[PDB]
């Protein structure tokens, strides 16, 4: 029943809510070739974010979206005979969610009372829904709480993150999620582990690896509770930086890793990141068969200005000429301009990569560019404000006139399709 890599030989569930979002853009554009590229984009599986208790129930409780059961019912109707199918879910309601965000939309407080709600009203309801014999023929693939554990390693100076650590609540929430979800034999769990590479940098690697190891080892099944890891969830870092294959290359006596853009971080892309983590986890005693997912929904960095080479007599000129990631700063995560769709969802593309997945479907907003009245409790994170100067000293790169988090952003969508790499 429980196979090593649930993506092998399997189709994927195509979410009709994402299709309906895409359709809303198709009818606005008169370019029939662009319409066609959008038809193709909505043919790909996209992950379903359970970003609140309300998201489990759908309907009027969640902006008209399908309930969890509605998703699982639709998945049944898409399953081909004698062919497995994966249903992608994002488990995303940690107490004190997004401790490093300027404005988190997480509903649950970072308290023991918050944790008990997480257990009873969120995880337990999801787990009992997934355990229904009606759905035994589906393979459920979970992205486990993005934007949670890595902050305990890199952002402990932020008070909310220091408290997520010292309270034990993040670790308690992950353990409970893994215990209840791994107990269902057709459920596969992939631990979110960020994207930047800062988790692997210098004195961060040991606490990062030991943190993930300690949390999963303490579950009932130990390391078997996690089938693997996922990087780049909802972010933009490219699969490869093809013009900068060697971070140690020196120009003017300095390695290009020391350019402004990388700030001494030798991990330039998600392929390098996943391999660095894989080797470290195997070094910590994880089984060699662990797999990595990479979210490639918005990390293509294509279009007609994508660099094809690198040149320059100093590391900054060189790196900036050649990097396909065109962001002002690798810390800019919201509604990024210039970004394009990346690799389509792809099973077992090579090595220890179990799959390329569209963790976040391109076109949905990362947050509004102002505070917009809404009934979902979605706020205004200045990292979504195009005019905001971040603590890193650059603007955000976010697209202007953005709607609230998790709702459709037509202008970003058109841009993402136009700039797809590979092209649609």
What does this structure look like?
The PDB classes it as hydrolase. Keywords: exoglucanase, Xoo, cell-wall degrading enzyme, bacterial blight, hydrolase. The structure is a monomer. α1 packs antiparallel against α2 and α5 (112-130) packs parallel to α8 (169-182). The longest helix is centred in the first third of the chain and has 19 residues, at 112-130. This protein has a single domain (1-424), classed as 1, 4-beta cellobiohydrolase (TIM Barrel, Alpha-Beta Barrel), CATH 3.20.20.40. The chain contains 12 helices and 11 strands. It has helices at residues 16-26, 32-41, 53-57, 68-78, 112-130, 149-154, 159-166, 169-182, 205-217, 270-283, 315-322, 410-418; strands at residues 11-12, 48-50, 85-91, 139-144, 187-192, 228-231, 250-251, 254-255, 291-295, 346-350, 353-357. It has 424 residues and is an alpha/beta fold. The two termini are 35 Å apart. The strands form 2 sheets. Strands 1, 2, 3, 4, 5, 6, 9, 10 and 11 form a 9-stranded mixed beta sheet that branches. β10 (346-350) and β11 form a beta hairpin.
Give a quick summary of the entry.
The protein has 424 residues and is an alpha/beta fold.
- The CATH topology turns out to be TIM Barrel
> What's the structural domain tally?
1
End-to-end Cα distance: 35 Å
- Profile the largest sheet: 9 strands, mixed
Number of strands: 11
Radius of gyration: 20 Å
What is the structural class? alpha/beta
Brief descriptors of the model:
424 residues, alpha/beta, two-stranded antiparallel ribbon, 9-stranded mixed beta sheet, TIM Barrel, 30% helix, 12 helices
